[PDB]
Design an enzyme around this catalytic site. Sequence first.
Site, PDB file in Angstrom:
ATOM      1  N   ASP A 162      35.023  37.271  30.037  1.00  0.00           N
ATOM      2  CA  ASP A 162      35.570  38.461  30.670  1.00  0.00           C
ATOM      3  C   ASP A 162      34.552  38.988  31.667  1.00  0.00           C
ATOM      4  O   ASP A 162      33.440  39.325  31.264  1.00  0.00           O
ATOM      5  CB  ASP A 162      35.902  39.543  29.633  1.00  0.00           C
ATOM      6  CG  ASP A 162      36.629  40.729  30.243  1.00  0.00           C
ATOM      7  OD1 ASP A 162      36.004  41.476  31.020  1.00  0.00           O
ATOM      8  OD2 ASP A 162      37.827  40.923  29.945  1.00  0.00           O
ATOM      9  N   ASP A 214      40.240  37.899  35.921  1.00  0.00           N
ATOM     10  CA  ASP A 214      38.839  37.895  35.533  1.00  0.00           C
ATOM     11  C   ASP A 214      38.590  37.457  34.096  1.00  0.00           C
ATOM     12  O   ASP A 214      37.469  37.651  33.600  1.00  0.00           O
ATOM     13  CB  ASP A 214      38.236  39.280  35.766  1.00  0.00           C
ATOM     14  CG  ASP A 214      38.397  40.203  34.575  1.00  0.00           C
ATOM     15  OD1 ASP A 214      39.393  40.118  33.821  1.00  0.00           O
ATOM     16  OD2 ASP A 214      37.502  41.033  34.380  1.00  0.00           O
ATOM     17  N   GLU A 215      39.586  36.898  33.401  1.00  0.00           N
ATOM     18  CA  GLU A 215      39.333  36.522  32.017  1.00  0.00           C
ATOM     19  C   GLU A 215      40.164  35.310  31.620  1.00  0.00           C
ATOM     20  O   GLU A 215      41.185  34.986  32.241  1.00  0.00           O
ATOM     21  CB  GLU A 215      39.587  37.680  31.033  1.00  0.00           C
ATOM     22  CG  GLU A 215      41.030  38.061  30.803  1.00  0.00           C
ATOM     23  CD  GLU A 215      41.169  39.342  29.966  1.00  0.00           C
ATOM     24  OE1 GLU A 215      41.680  39.281  28.828  1.00  0.00           O
ATOM     25  OE2 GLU A 215      40.741  40.415  30.436  1.00  0.00           O
TER      26      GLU A 215
HETATM   27 MG   LIG Z   1      39.591  41.231  31.855  1.00  0.00          MG
HETATM   28 MG   LIG Z   2      36.633  42.551  32.798  1.00  0.00          MG
END
Ligand SMILES: [Mg+2]
Ligand SMILES: [Mg+2]
Length: 342
Positions: A9, A104-105
């Site tokens: 993350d 983003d993850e």
């Molecule tokens: Mg995230």
């Molecule tokens: Mg994040």
Amino acid sequence: GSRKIIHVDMDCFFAAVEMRDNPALRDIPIAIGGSRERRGVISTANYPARKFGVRSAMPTGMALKLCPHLTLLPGRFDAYKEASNHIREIFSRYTSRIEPLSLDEAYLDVTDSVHCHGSATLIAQEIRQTIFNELQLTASAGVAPVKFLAKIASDMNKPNGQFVITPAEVPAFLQTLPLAKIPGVGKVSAAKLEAMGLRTCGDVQKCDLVMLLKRFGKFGRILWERSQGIDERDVNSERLRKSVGVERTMAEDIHHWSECEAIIERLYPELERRLAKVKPDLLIARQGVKLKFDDFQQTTQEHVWPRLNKADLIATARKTWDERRGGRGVRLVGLHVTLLDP
DNA sequence: TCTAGGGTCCTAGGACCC
DNA sequence: TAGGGTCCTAGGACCCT
Ligand SMILES: [Mg+2]
Ligand SMILES: [Mg+2]
């Protein structure tokens, strides 16, 4: 047969990108979000702004009252997409078992990985270091035997840190784990659970599955499972997008159909452009519209339709406008398509 | 303070089929 | 032959930033 699941993350993702690309923003409070005049909310903030209480989903007028010096940024989405593509390519160096959950993850299943002597702890550390080395952005990570615990774990040691939960550690971890920390247990559910005396996974462990099933349906089985660490959801690398939407909240409410039609004329080329990127012939399963009113009730009306078509979206918005507006101001207009199944 | 825009998933009633 | 199945549709919780 225990799995090894990593959740990676990025730290303060949009803000971290903006600070890397403009170091003048590194040490002052910044946030990506619409202006107060655009009636915006915060997408995210850096740690100097978070110190004042600025948070994602906070109305910008509130963030500026908490943090008068807040520097507001409009967002550079191709820059975030490029960072996203790069970290997913870095994930691929370690496994093909990658389930992205947003830009983003991602979940990684490294059960069958031979990298780093089979250590998911070291794989996570190497991924985080590589991300920093190649993107000059930091990431945090969580390691656990199942998805939801890995995702919880990645928050525990942020920023630029990681946290590992072994099977031996799962019972102690669950006992006082707040239910609201489970992804999918949101504010409304946590409040309903709190009102029946259920705050932690330890509390739910004292509950009967049958009662939870009657009281919550399928959600009740998920609560029962997660509260004892059960989460058999496999990491799935084959998910595909199902819908495309384009919507705008106006700086002032509109009160006239002419204004609504004018907004749609602006939204439509954008919807067409984004659909054409993934479906050049514009063939679709459904299309439709969205209105949000000045008191925040929202309506959508969509229907089977074979190919993106502006006039039908205008016609549909006209019906919704005439039939459901009731003299209220409209703060948002949106367009929507549902993509063909496969 | 005054509430975004990108999405996923689940629910539930009626239509429709057998 | 008294209810068994499966889409269409609107709404809403929830997720990420
Ligand atoms: Mg995230
Ligand atoms: Mg994040």
